[PDB]
Amino acid sequence: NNLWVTVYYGVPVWRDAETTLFCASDAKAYDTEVHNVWATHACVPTDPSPQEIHLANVTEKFDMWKNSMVEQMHTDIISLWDESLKPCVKLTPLCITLNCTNITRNLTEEGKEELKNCSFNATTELRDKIQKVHSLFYRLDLVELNNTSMYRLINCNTSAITQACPKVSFEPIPIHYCAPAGFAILKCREKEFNGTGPCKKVSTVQCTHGIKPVVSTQLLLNGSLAEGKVKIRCENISNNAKTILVQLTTPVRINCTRPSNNTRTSIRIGPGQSFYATGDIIGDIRKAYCNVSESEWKEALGKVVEQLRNHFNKTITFASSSGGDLEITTHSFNCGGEFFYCNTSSLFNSTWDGNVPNGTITLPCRIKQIINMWQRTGQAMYAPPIPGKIRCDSNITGLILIRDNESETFRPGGGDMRNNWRSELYKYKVVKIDPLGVAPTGAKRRVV
Amino acid sequence: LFGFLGAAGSTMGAASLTLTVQARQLLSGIVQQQSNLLRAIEAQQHLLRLTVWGIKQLQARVLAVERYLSDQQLLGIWGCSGKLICTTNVPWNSSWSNKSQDEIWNNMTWLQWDKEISNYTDTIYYLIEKSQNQQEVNEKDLLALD
Amino acid sequence: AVGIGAVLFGFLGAAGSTMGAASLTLTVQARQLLSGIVQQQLRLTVWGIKQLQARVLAVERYLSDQQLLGIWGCSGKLICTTNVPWNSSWSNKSQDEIWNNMTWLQWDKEISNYTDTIYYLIEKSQNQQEVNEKDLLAL
């Protein structure tokens, strides 16, 4: 009959608020041997590894295009990037003229038109003396003025160059993300999850899995895979999507290298501050290249077309992107301190219709040293050379398609790095536990 | 034995007769007691630079707040809110310790009990929170019965 | 080398169970509200401030609900009863319809417009009770 208010404390409910996460450490047997960009020693340890409780009978709406874990992770990867370059050496004594002529010399016969020694008057540690100093420079990192012509660097017009400290590593060590007390991360375990909509299999976790901060355009490297078949995710089905997230099931093992035994010299430009140049290449100068196995790239690219039919009925033409700048036109990645730029015009050549395995696809890769990271202007960065030969061997675990007759065309994507982080952070969000609940029962406070 | 931690060394029969000494230094004399933390704030206002000793006073305050609230919460989940010796309905399982009362209360200190029972307290705390939760449910619908 | 032993109740494990058997696990969520994974077994890093901000936030939210319990008559308790009669314009549902049939997070999305009105009436009847318990001690 008479019902009364009774309040409960410890109630399992949650809103969908957003907050400040923090990182955790993943089994690093270094324990401060070297330092890297990502400052992974500053993360917390955990004596149990992070866990996962299966929650029964609950459904929950996710939305991978309005998840704020991606925008929070994007501001953190830039923040950790700028923390490391700030104590490194400012490199203003290279804004001078660069008088040089191509290189000198069974035959080498390659790299004659993409690389040249350039001599210049540097500063010494006395600010009264000059030193005549040569250095090898890539053709991309030089600009004509007006045989031995006069050159200058790219962003000496627009920026202030700082080189990277060579002890700091660019290796993407995995980072977890953890929630403070009173918060939770809910992940979707359902295999047929298309990015948005509800989810009948949710579980809560202490921390996420290991996300590797791999920076790449047009392709996804060293990521996660798919359980079932190839999932394809766009924003909204309204013919204005323009970006497609393809997630593969089996990888396509890129192997990629630059063959050259180049050296590295140390050149003092002030009180202790040293410029690390490129001395000489020992042996035969070659191009840089990535190999793609033509067998299973043809297999993997075909399965993408099979699942694009379920969204779109038009015929499929994979055409390479055409743009001005070299960053969103090529495939940029990183091998231990070298920034490659690979022409993927042959991986995206063919057209497809509603209806080979001997060779290997070989891609021509350029390489440069002055880098405008994170689509910012004014804060260029000089990557020092690495002695010897380098070799990478990574996995294509997905790819990014930008959309531009009745025959639709998917150019290769690139540009924004937030699309790299929606590939990984799509399957979980942050909630906020509210312990006070209130409900009517038949018990009233027995007074005095 | 009177004095802070002076009963460390006596047996736990006599070390538990003077528990007020510890539950006053750890409830009163931690945050309420000091007013000289806001006498060092204006001296930090005179200098225009954040010093090293200003960071360490954050970390010694946030450790002082959390150490106070993570022992009052745990006494709040149980029925032992504002008191120092409280009894529960949890029967003592002899696989936690088979040891007799005369050996425990009269030939063993509290600091020798820390180094014996510490593997078991996470199991013991689960059974105090569960039986407190079963009690308040039972005294609600009993209340609503009459 | 580890292995899963026996299992007990876990955090949020009664979410979406029901409303009457999810109130038998109130201590399981109330244990995980103050201390998290932040507390384990050199200065001003990006990950250092972001860890310290998570510790100041976790005290401010805990003290918010713990204040609000003591303003009511319900301090140090998990289920307490008030003298505020339930008003059917807040919700008209039956007694066997919210217990044994409804879960929390379905009842949360139902009365979340009325909680600010409900909270005011619990605080008002606590002032009226404590004045009367004072004025009963004058005899």
Epitope: D31, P45, Q51 | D122 | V2, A6, V7, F9, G10, F11
Partner: antibody, heavy 134, light 112 residues
Framework: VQLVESGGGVVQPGKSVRLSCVVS????????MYWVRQAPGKGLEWVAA????????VYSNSVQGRFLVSRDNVKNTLYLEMNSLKIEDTAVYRC????????????????????????????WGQGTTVTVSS | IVMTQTPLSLSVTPGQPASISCKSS???????????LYWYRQKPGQSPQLLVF???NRFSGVSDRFVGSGSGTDFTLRISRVEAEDVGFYYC?????????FGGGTKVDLKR
């Protein structure tokens, strides 16, 4: 310390044996025990592992659903059953002991689970054998 | 977790130190911070015998000639001044996760 075995012999395919491993002067409720397997002219393998709690037992992948490990903390014994014996199990079966005692199960509060801890070896047994034949 | 060793057999001189290395696929650093590498010894027709029960520390009853090293996945075992009690079979064991796998196994011999 001394670790004594028995119970080994010669059987047919499709039979059941019962090995045994009696210990000497342990607490033995603190130490979880093992079973390794060495084929003739081969390297060592791992078969099974029971805890000192006698509650959580694990098996190898090849021997799953066929074996049964138990123990009696009063009698200080190990009781390895076997069922549906194949031909490739002709080897030597050694019981073993971890070099330190695992403690109690450690309750994790966030998920409500108990965890056991496993590590290496001190004392292999004498070494008894089972040879299956026709 | 797989295990591979170099070499499969040694042929050394008494009084000359040698070394045997093990290689793991996954890193064996547990969440305790301590690794899970174990160095064993089986004489022919004999029960096995522990020698080094971490990266570094030596079993109670083993002479100081056996030193251990390594971190991550690369590990070694450097015998100092090989003698007549140092022949037989040497094993690597992980205890990071089940199943508790053993290594391949070396056969240390002299030159008769």
């Amino acid at each position: 310390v001394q670790l004594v075995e028995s119970g080994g012999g010669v059987v047919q395919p499709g039979k059941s044996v019962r090995l045994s491993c009696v210990v000497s002067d342990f607490p033995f409720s603190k130490y979880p025990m093992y079973w390794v397997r060495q084929a003739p002219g081969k390297g060592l393998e791992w078969v099974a592992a029971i805890s000192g709690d006698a509650w959580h037992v694990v098996y190898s992948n090849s021997v799953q659903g066929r074996f049964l490990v138990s123990r009696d903390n009063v009698k200080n014994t190990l009781y390895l059953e076997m069922n549906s014996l194949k031909i490739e199990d002709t080897a030597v079966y050694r019981c073993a002991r971890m070099f330190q005692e695992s403690g109690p199960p450690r309750l994790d509060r966030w998920s409500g689970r108990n965890y056991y801890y496993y590590s290496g070896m001190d004392v292999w047994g004498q070494g008894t054998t089972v040879t299956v034949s026709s | 977790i797989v295990m591979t060793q170099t070499p499969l057999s040694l042929s050394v001189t008494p009084g000359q130190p040698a070394s045997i290395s093990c290689k793991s696929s996954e890193s064996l650093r547990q969440s305790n911070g301590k690794t899970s590498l174990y160095w064993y010894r089986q004489k022919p027709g004999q029960s096995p015998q522990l020698l080094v029960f971490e990266v570094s520390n030596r079993f109670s009853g083993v002479s100081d000639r056996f030193v251990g090293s390594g971190s991550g996945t690369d590990f070694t075992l450097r015998i100092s001044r090989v003698e007549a009690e140092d022949v037989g079979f040497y094993y690597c064991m992980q205890s990071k996760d089940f199943p508790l796998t053993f290594g391949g196994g070396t056969k240390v011999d002299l030159k008769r």
